[PDB]
Short mmCIF file of C-alpha atoms in Angstrom, two decimals:
data_model
loop_
_atom_site.label_atom_id
_atom_site.label_comp_id
_atom_site.label_asym_id
_atom_site.label_seq_id
_atom_site.Cartn_x
_atom_site.Cartn_y
_atom_site.Cartn_z
CA UNK D 1 -25.01 12.59 39.00
CA UNK D 2 -25.98 14.96 39.97
CA UNK D 3 -27.21 16.47 36.95
CA UNK D 4 -31.06 15.50 36.58
CA UNK D 5 -31.67 12.98 34.79
CA UNK D 6 -29.76 13.83 31.08
CA UNK D 7 -28.67 17.71 29.94
CA UNK D 8 -27.34 18.92 27.29
CA UNK D 9 -23.12 20.33 27.16
CA UNK D 10 -21.73 22.36 24.63
CA UNK D 11 -18.71 22.85 23.66
CA UNK D 12 -16.16 25.52 22.73
CA UNK D 13 -14.91 26.33 19.54
CA UNK D 14 -15.43 22.38 17.94
CA UNK D 15 -14.92 22.82 14.06
CA UNK D 16 -11.22 24.55 15.30
CA UNK D 17 -10.43 21.97 17.79
CA UNK D 18 -11.34 19.81 15.08
CA UNK D 19 -8.89 21.21 11.95
CA UNK D 20 -6.01 20.96 14.87
CA UNK D 21 -7.12 17.70 15.68
CA UNK D 22 -6.92 16.88 11.76
CA UNK D 23 -2.99 18.88 11.64
CA UNK D 24 -1.64 17.34 14.74
CA UNK D 25 -2.60 13.48 13.98
CA UNK D 26 -1.46 13.79 10.54
CA UNK D 27 1.15 14.63 11.90
CA UNK D 28 1.94 11.66 13.40
CA UNK D 29 1.29 9.74 11.26
CA UNK D 30 3.50 10.77 9.60
CA UNK D 31 6.23 10.68 12.54
CA UNK D 32 5.70 6.71 12.28
CA UNK D 33 5.04 5.39 9.49
CA UNK D 34 8.67 8.01 9.01
CA UNK D 35 9.99 5.99 12.60
CA UNK D 36 9.44 2.90 10.35
CA UNK D 37 11.27 3.87 7.53
CA UNK D 38 14.75 5.19 9.83
CA UNK D 39 14.40 1.21 10.92
CA UNK D 40 14.60 -0.16 7.82
CA UNK D 41 17.38 1.82 6.88
CA UNK D 42 19.07 1.20 9.62
CA UNK D 43 18.61 -2.93 9.34
CA UNK D 44 19.52 -2.70 5.85
CA UNK D 45 22.92 -0.69 7.45
CA UNK D 46 23.36 -3.57 9.50
CA UNK D 47 23.39 -5.51 6.80
CA UNK H 1 -41.39 21.14 24.02
CA UNK H 2 -39.09 23.10 24.38
CA UNK H 3 -37.90 21.12 27.37
CA UNK H 4 -34.24 19.26 26.47
CA UNK H 5 -35.14 15.32 27.00
CA UNK H 6 -36.30 15.58 30.51
CA UNK H 7 -37.12 18.17 33.41
CA UNK H 8 -38.04 17.43 36.49
CA UNK H 9 -40.48 19.20 38.13
CA UNK H 10 -41.50 20.01 41.69
CA UNK H 11 -45.47 20.16 42.52
CA UNK H 12 -46.80 22.58 45.26
CA UNK H 13 -48.36 21.61 48.42
CA UNK H 14 -49.17 18.08 46.73
CA UNK H 15 -49.91 15.91 50.62
CA UNK H 16 -52.80 19.04 51.63
CA UNK H 17 -53.98 18.95 47.76
CA UNK H 18 -53.31 14.65 48.48
CA UNK H 19 -55.83 14.63 51.46
CA UNK H 20 -58.70 18.02 49.70
CA UNK H 21 -58.85 15.54 46.65
CA UNK H 22 -59.47 12.43 49.31
CA UNK H 23 -62.59 14.64 50.72
CA UNK H 24 -64.15 15.99 47.45
CA UNK H 25 -63.88 12.90 46.09
CA UNK H 26 -65.58 10.75 49.61
CA UNK H 27 -68.34 13.82 49.46
CA UNK H 28 -68.94 13.08 44.98
CA UNK H 29 -69.57 9.15 45.81
CA UNK H 30 -71.33 9.84 48.59
CA UNK H 31 -74.17 12.17 47.12
CA UNK H 32 -73.34 9.07 44.44
CA UNK H 33 -74.86 6.39 46.61
CA UNK H 34 -77.63 8.73 48.07
CA UNK H 35 -78.92 10.19 44.78
CA UNK H 36 -79.66 5.87 43.64
CA UNK H 37 -81.06 6.08 46.93
CA UNK H 38 -83.45 8.20 46.54
CA UNK H 39 -84.67 6.93 42.27
CA UNK H 40 -85.51 4.19 44.60
CA UNK H 41 -87.27 5.50 47.21
CA UNK H 42 -88.73 7.18 44.34
CA UNK H 43 -89.92 4.07 42.12
CA UNK H 44 -91.21 2.94 45.52
CA UNK H 45 -93.31 5.60 45.70
CA UNK H 46 -93.95 4.95 42.09
CA UNK H 47 -94.89 1.58 43.42
#
C-alpha cells in the first residue's frame, strides 16, 4: 500500500551490485575460516 | 498487453450511463412485449 494491485519497479545497477556482493561475501567467508583456524591454533598452543 | 500486471482504470459518468441504460432497456422490453401482442392480434384477426 498504496500501490494499486502489483506494480513493476526497476533496480539501479543490479549487475555491479551483484559483483560487489560476491566479493564482500567471499572475503567475509575467508575471514570466518581464518578465525576458526586462529582459534584452533590458540587451542593447540594451550596444549 | 502492454499494461504491466493489472492496472486500475476509471469509467466516465457510470451512474448517469446506468440510468440511461435502464431507460433504454425498459423501452426495448416494452417494444418486445408490444410486438408480441400485435402479432397475436394479427393472428386473431386472421381467425
